């Protein structure tokens, strides 16, 4: 169980609905998708890295401090205002939060100190139209990009057998030169990675409790969802989009809509996910990653 540190140094576009939307972190779906496409391009085998590996979502970090998503636990006060405005809780204070030891003023201070990047829109045009030869409008369009301070970035949580971890490290060595976002070929999204161990993160990841904090985007398989939702606090997130090299027409190929729990849901009955298939009318199967990575407290 290692973590992988990511520093960017170039703006990255991550996207929700259009190109001119900017987003800070990315989900396990696009992460596994990038790993899988990099593997296929490299020509190695996918069986090893399909049904053994567990990937957690990407989360941001700052100078020396790491972050995790806000648990969706019922804190019984009544402000319900400063906490709603909080999105990430530093690791130093995680167990303090889950025991209701976080004060309103401390929450305000954390919100004040949480600057880890800013948003930008760069305007771009496209003269590929008749403009080159005849009177034709240049078509302006915008892309949403997000940048980090020189001491920031994203990090991973990965776990599995050591052989799978070695394969993952190889693939990431390959991948640091492809992208991890949107307009990869337009100049966005190259990174350097580094493997680090953290004593505090390790203790947090190997705790023992009664609840569970979901750190990835997963969906229970058909026969286990019924028992999964006995006592659950969760939010669903729709995940759609097109696919890369499935048929002749990109604009005719579009993945089937899929729904999965978010990255902060709390469950009482642990379930195992699966790599659901979201293909139809296609030559090769298309995958989406739904497999949980729990922390028990």
């Amino acid at each position: 169980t290692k973590v992988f540190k990511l520093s960017f140094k170039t703006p990255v576009h991550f996207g929700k609905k259009r190109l001119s939307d900017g987003e800070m972190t990315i989900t396990a779906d696009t992460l596994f998708s990038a790993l899988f496409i990099e593997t296929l391009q490299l020509g190695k085998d996918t069986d090893w890295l399909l049904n053994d590996l567990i990937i957690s979502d990407t989360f941001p970090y700052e100078n020396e401090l790491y972050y995790l998503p806000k648990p969706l636990i019922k804190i019984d006060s009544d402000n319900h205002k400063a906490f709603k405005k909080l999105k990430y809780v530093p690791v130093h204070h995680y167990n303090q939060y889950l025991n209701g030891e976080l004060s309103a003023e401390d929450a305000t201070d954390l919100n004040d100190i949480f600057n880890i990047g800013y948003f930008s829109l760069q305007t771009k045009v496209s003269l590929i139209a008749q403009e080159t030869d005849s009177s034709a409008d240049s078509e302006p369009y915008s892309v949403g990009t997000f940048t980090f301070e020189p001491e920031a970035g994203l990090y991973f949580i990965a776990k599995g057998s050591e052989e799978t971890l070695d394969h993952l490290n190889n693939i990431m060595t390959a991948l640091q030169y492809s992208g991890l976002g949107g307009k990869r070929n337009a100049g966005y999204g190259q990174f350097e990675y580094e493997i680090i161990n953290n004593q505090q993160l390790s203790k947090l990841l190997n705790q023992n409790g009664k609840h569970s904090i979901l750190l990835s985007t997963a969906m229970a398989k058909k026969e286990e969802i019924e028992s999964a939702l006995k006592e659950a606090r969760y939010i669903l997130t729709k995940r759609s989009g097109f696919v890369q090299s499935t048929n002749y027409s990109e604009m005719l190929v579009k993945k089937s809509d899929f729904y999965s729990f978010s990255s902060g849901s709390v469950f009482k009955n642990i379930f195992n996910g699966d790599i659901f298939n979201v293909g139809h009318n296609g030559k090769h199967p298309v995958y989406r990653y739904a497999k949980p990575l729990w922390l028990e407290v």
Binding site: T10, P11, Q41, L42, G43, Y118, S120, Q122, T123, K124, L127, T132, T147, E149, T173, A174, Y177, S178, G179, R184, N185, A186, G187, Y188, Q190, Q244, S245, Y248, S249, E250
Partner: protein
């Protein structure tokens, strides 16, 4: 399979004006140091190369819109000032970006309305990186010949705005070719 890295620096022979804000120039909203978007480089190379001849230009950048789909083979990345230029200008106390004043003459009227434009200082150096993904062995020599031709045309052309008016001329120096993934020799490939 393997990946080839093309790294080097570019100089502005005359001032450069990408000007995404426009009359400002593109910057980073915190560091305020000007950059060069990779979209500009990619678009100018693609236009010049296409106008130099539609399979090879399809092959390098990839269109994937015409019922047949081709993944891009050459990735451009953004640029930033070199540390050398920052040190040099700080030592010599030189402003990073100039502001030229201009006009325009109304015919039958001959009254000039002024104009203000912001221009990157001459002689700055930007750092650039290209990544090439060799997917067909028998094509690397032709592809690099084409990319050299594209660089050659770009050296004899302009980037950004008002190129016919006397800005945007650039130059390429200190270019090395290094293989970083895989086992393809990248010592017989040249880009001037």
């Amino acid at each position: 399979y393997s990946k080839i890295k093309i790294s080097g620096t570019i100089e502005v022979v005359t001032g450069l004006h990408i000007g995404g804000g426009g009359s400002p120039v593109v910057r980073d909203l915190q560091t305020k140091l000007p950059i060069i978007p990779g979209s500009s480089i990619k678009g100018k190379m693609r236009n010049l190369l296409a106008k130099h001849f539609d399979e090879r230009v399809l092959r390098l950048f990839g269109s994937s819109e015409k019922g047949n789909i081709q993944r891009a083979r050459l990735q451009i990345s953004d640029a930033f000032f070199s540390e050398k230029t920052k040190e040099h200008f700080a030592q010599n106390d030189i402003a990073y970006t100039e502001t030229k004043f201009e006009n325009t003459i109304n015919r039958l009227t001959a009254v000039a309305n002024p104009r203000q434009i912001e221009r990157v200082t001459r002689g700055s150096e930007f750092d650039f990186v290209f990544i090439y993904n060799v997917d067909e062995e028998s094509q690397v020599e032709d592809d690099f010949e084409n990319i050299e031709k594209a660089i050659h045309l770009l050296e004899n052309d302009y980037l950004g705005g008002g190129g016919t008016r006397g800005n945007g001329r650039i130059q390429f120096k200190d270019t090395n070719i290094e293989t970083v993934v895989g086992e393809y020799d990248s010592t017989n490939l040249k880009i001037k």
